[PDB]
């Protein structure tokens, strides 16, 4: 797309390794750090996709 093809996404954040032939469809928040993010998705909490 000349403007942008925002139809593909890929994960950067995972808790651990991914064993072969399985999927991780998950719209969650990656809770890094000490702050208990409750869906705020603020600092140190980034959207994995």
């Amino acid at each position: 797309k000349v403007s942008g093809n925002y139809n593909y996404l890929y994960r950067l954040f995972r808790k651990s390794k991914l064993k072969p032939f399985e999927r991780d469809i998950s719209t969650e928040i990656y809770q890094a750090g000490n702050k208990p993010c409750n869906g705020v998705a603020g600092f140190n909490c980034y959207f994995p996709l």
């Binding site: 950067l12 990656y30 890094a32 600092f43």
Partner: protein, 49 residues
């Protein structure tokens, strides 16, 4: 003595230990948009310069 946008001073850093954790205690970091490289993994990926 932070420089302006028009004239920036480039620092060639080729000998140190890039601990990107002390920067977390520098500011609340309102603007922390990062590119393809994952912010949570920077110590594992070594950079030429």
């Amino acid at each position: 003595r932070f420089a302006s946008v028009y004239a920036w001073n480039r620092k060639r850093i080729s000998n140190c230990v890039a601990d990107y954790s002390v920067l977390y205690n520098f500011a609340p970091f309102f603007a922390f948009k990062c590119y393809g490289v994952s912010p949570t993994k920077l110590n594992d990926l070594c950079f030429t310069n």
